[PDB]
Amino acid sequence: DIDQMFSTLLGEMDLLTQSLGVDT
Amino acid sequence: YGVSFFLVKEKMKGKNKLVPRLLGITKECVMRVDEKTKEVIQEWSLTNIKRWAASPKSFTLDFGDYQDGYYSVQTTEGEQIAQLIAGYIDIIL
């Protein structure tokens, strides 16, 4: 089921560049 | 054609930017390899994938959305990582 996925994951990826990372 | 490898960047600790890395898609898993040693630091079933998202600069995996299933890195070749993954979930499914 495709629709926003891309943006749904890209928006999440933003959390990988923010500052945290994986919070271990 | 078997296990695939992609040099991707990941957000490590000690700084704020990403760190070049090495991914390894296995027809049974996904893993964060140490571009430095080529050894695996992390692993995750490929047949466990929920939904992924390759981009022209980065690629991403969604497995664990129950909590935090989103594992992503920076790579200018996602569709390569994703199509295969996508092609691997096509097998193991």
Side-chain angles (χ1 to χ4, degrees):
Chain A
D1 21 295
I2 320 184
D3 227 288
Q4 267 178 168
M5 298 211 310
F6 318 106
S7 213
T8 337
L9 274 300
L10 242 299
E12 274 276 6
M13 277 213 67
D14 229 277
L15 282 288
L16 137 169
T17 282
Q18 240 151 82
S19 122
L20 275 52
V22 180
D23 181 18
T24 54
Chain B
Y1 239 107
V3 177
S4 355
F5 285 114
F6 285 85
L7 96 308
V8 301
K9 320 180 203 300
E10 198 176 9
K11 169 50 161 264
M12 296 287 106
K13 73 303 201 337
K15 56 181 106 190
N16 246 225
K17 319 103 64 137
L18 309 187
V19 161
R21 191 141 281 284
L22 196 205
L23 168 67
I25 308 308
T26 87
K27 244 180 242 298
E28 52 183 307
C29 109
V30 193
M31 33 184 208
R32 308 250 169 274
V33 199
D34 195 354
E35 212 223 301
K36 296 164 154 294
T37 95
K38 211 181 240 295
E39 78 206 344
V40 175
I41 277 153
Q42 185 161 100
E43 299 173 298
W44 243 301
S45 9
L46 213 165
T47 311
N48 277 20
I49 291 176
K50 210 182 190 226
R51 47 194 211 207
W52 54 108
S55 110
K57 314 189 114 180
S58 56
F59 141 85
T60 292
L61 273 155
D62 201 316
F63 169 53
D65 197 308
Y66 328 118
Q67 33 151 34
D68 203 65
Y70 334 136
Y71 253 110
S72 183
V73 277
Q74 224 175 63
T75 157
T76 32
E77 346 179 301
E79 48 177 49
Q80 297 194 13
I81 287 162
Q83 68 198 11
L84 114 73
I85 264 171
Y88 278 20
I89 354 183
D90 220 278
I91 299 163
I92 69 210
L93 44 65

